[PDB]
Amino acid sequence: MEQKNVRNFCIIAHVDHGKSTLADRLLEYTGAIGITVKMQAVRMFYKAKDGNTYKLHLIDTPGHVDFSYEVSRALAACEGALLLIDASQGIEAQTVANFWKAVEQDLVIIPVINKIDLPSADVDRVKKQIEEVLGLDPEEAILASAKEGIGIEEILEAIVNRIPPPKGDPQKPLKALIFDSYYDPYRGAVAFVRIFDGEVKPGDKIMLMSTGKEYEVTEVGAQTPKMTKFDKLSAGDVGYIAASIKDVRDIRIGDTITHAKNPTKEPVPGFQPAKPMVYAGIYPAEDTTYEELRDALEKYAINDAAIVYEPESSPALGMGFRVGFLGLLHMEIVQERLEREYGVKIITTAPNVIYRVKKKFTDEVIEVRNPMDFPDNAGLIEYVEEPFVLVTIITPKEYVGPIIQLCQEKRGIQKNMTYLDPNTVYLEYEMPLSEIIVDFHDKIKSISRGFASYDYEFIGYRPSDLIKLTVLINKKPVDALSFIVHADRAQKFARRVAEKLRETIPRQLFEVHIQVAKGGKVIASERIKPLR
Numbered sequence: 419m420e421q422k423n424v425r426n427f428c429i430i431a432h433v434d435h436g437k438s439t440l441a442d443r444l445l446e447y448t449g450a451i452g453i454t455v456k457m458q459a460v461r462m463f464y465k466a467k468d469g470n471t472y473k474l475h476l477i478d479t480p481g482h483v484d485f486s487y488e489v490s491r492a493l494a495a496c497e498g499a500l501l502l503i504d505a506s507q508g509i510e511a512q513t514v515a516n517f518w519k520a521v522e523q524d525l526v527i528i529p530v531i532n533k534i535d536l537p538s539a540d541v542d543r544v545k546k547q548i549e550e551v552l553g554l555d556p557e558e559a560i561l562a563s564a565k566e567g568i569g570i571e572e573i574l575e576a577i578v579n580r581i582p583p584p585k586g587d588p589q590k591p592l593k594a595l596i597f598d599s600y601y602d603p604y605r606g607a608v609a610f611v612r613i614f615d616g617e618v619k620p621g622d623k624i625m626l627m628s629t630g631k632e633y634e635v636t637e638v639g640a641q642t643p644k645m646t647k648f649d650k651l652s653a654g655d656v657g658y659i660a661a662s663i664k665d666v667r668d669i670r671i672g673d674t675i676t677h678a679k680n681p682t683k684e685p686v687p688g689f690q691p692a693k694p695m696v697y698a699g700i701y702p703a704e705d706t707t708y709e710e711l712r713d714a715l716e717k718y719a720i721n722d723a724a725i726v727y728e729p730e731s732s733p734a735l736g737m738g739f740r741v742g743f744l745g746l747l748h749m750e751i752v753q754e755r756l757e758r759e760y761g762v763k764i765i766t767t768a769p770n771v772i773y774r775v776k777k778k779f780t781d782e783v784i785e786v787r788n789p790m791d792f793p794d795n796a797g798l799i800e801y802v803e804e805p806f807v808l809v810t811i812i813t814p815k816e817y818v819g820p821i822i823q824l825c826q827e828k829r830g831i832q833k834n835m836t837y838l839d840p841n842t843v844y845l846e847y848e849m850p851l852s853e854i855i856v857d858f859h860d861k862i863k864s865i866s867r868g869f870a871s872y873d874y875e876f877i878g879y880r881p882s883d884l885i886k887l888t889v890l891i892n893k894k895p896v897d898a899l900s901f902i903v904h905a906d907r908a909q910k911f912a913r914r915v916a917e918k919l920r921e922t923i924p925r926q927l928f929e930v931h932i933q934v935a936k937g938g939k940v941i942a943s944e945r946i947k948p949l950r
């Protein structure tokens with residue numbers, strides 16, 4: 419055979435623990451060394467100690483909770499996972515979250531303790547966490563230093579020896595999982611796939627199972643590390659497929675590729691279309707025009723299958739777009755790329771979640787993605803529901819108090835509390851996503867001096883006493899500033915907002931009066947004295 423000598427794995431680790439550095443050592447070690455494609459579906463050849471040469475496929479994985487779905491699809495493409503832990507940090511929020519996603523996909527997990535070179539490295543501690551928190555055999559852990567290439571070979575041997583080979587039938591109908599993708603100006607929309615059953619080759623007539631759309635394969639291969647064309651990809655392989663595909667939304671992550679003529683029985687399970695959770699209005703800033711902004715968004719969207727947006731207008735700001743993102747990082751990523759890659763200046767509103775509103779006289783509940791569209795008439799509202807998430811937090815004991823007070827301030831309900839070790843606390847909180855996206859990240863970071871980490875997962879919608887607040891400047895209402903808040907938190911948010919603009923607005927002549935109203939009732943006033 420030969421598929422018996424294949425190894426499909428990924429690296430999962432909390433941000434900064436050394437994922438990239440380690441992947442570099444692996445490629446370097448194995449020899450794997452402008453129309454430049456992101457690292458993905460990298461094929462490597464490794465001659466093990468047992469004398470045999472193995473074909474290893476490194477699947478790159480997202481690291482932020484925003485790309486959780488994408489992360490799970492990549493894990494579904496592997497047989498194993500290298501769980502990288504910083505020896506000087508120990509297990510953190512994403513370490514645990516990823517570990518469980520790996521477990522959920524029945525992956526063989528190889529814990530790798532990185533940064534053993536650091537003076538602050540504490541292996542015995544980390545080994546202790548691995549056993550008590552993860553339930554893994556401390557002795558299975560591999561000690562390494564990706565910075566100094568220490569333990570690389572040991573990792574490659576663990577991959578060969580502990581991770582089982584792919585199991586599929588190349589003679590069966592094609593069945594390939596799409597775990598990633600990107601837009602290639604020449605090849606078109608290309609999908610990075612894991613082949614479970616069958617084979618695929620140029621000229622083949624393929625079909626996407628979620629849509630039933632068909633294409634003719636023009637090229638297949640993998641990164642070696644450069645995009646290299648192969649004659650085919652067979653059961654067990656990881657690579658890419660080009661087939662004159664218009665855009666990345668035609669080859670959605672998690673979808674299944676099969677043959678149009680002889681389609682596989684069922685698609686790989688777990689497909690889910692992209693699901694925006696956080697929206698914000700984006701308007702041109704400075705000299706940048708609406709056209710340039712729209713042009714930039716169109717060009718950007720080509721390479722992003724999750725983003726959505728639609729024209730939006732505000733009296734003050736004018737013409738802009740209501741954009742939906744997977745989360746705060748996704749939003750940040752998009753902003754930086756519009757300004758840095760298309761060089762447009764933008765003004766972004768405070769982000770907001772999607773509310774479900776039930777109004778009298780309207781049978782179906784409405785999804786509100788823009789606060790401006792939240793009904794102005796409170797009496798017409800029967801109820802409002804907002805998304806909630808389960809937040810997991812890991813922090814040194816010393817900061818538990820301030821953190822608990824923060825979560826509670828943000829309407830969090832504690833569900834669990836455990837000790838990862840004598841000085842490390844684990845916390846689980848059910849919190850509204852709307853509270854988490856305002857300033858939770860920086861507050862939790864400053865109070866923990868950056869030592870606390872957190873992760874979260876959507877757990878559903880729940881009714882809440884939410885209301886719409888409007889912001890007025892010189893009796894002039896700025897709909898772009900209207901926002902949704904819980905009735906009990908309204909007063910504080912109002913003050914913060916007013917006090918925020920009191921500084922954000924440039925001191926000038928005519929006194930500017932900032933008011934935050936609650937259905938016509940001013941509940942926060944802030945005015946900046948006229949110049950002179």
Ligand SMILES: Nc1nc2c(ncn2[C@@H]2O[C@H](COP(=O)(O)OP(=O)(O)NP(=O)(O)O)[C@@H](O)[C@H]2O)c(=O)[nH]1
Nearest residue numbers: 433434435436437438439481532533536563564565
């Ligand atoms: N001392 C030491 N530093 C290391 C080691 N591995 C990585 N680093 C350092 O840690 C920093 C972050 O490493 P990197 O590999 O980028 O982390 P990551 O997990 O890929 N981060 P992200 O998910 O954001 O891409 C870099 O400054 C890098 O040089 C190691 O074994 N020892």
Ligand SMILES: [Mg+2]
Nearest residue numbers: 436437438439
């Ligand atoms: Mg990295």
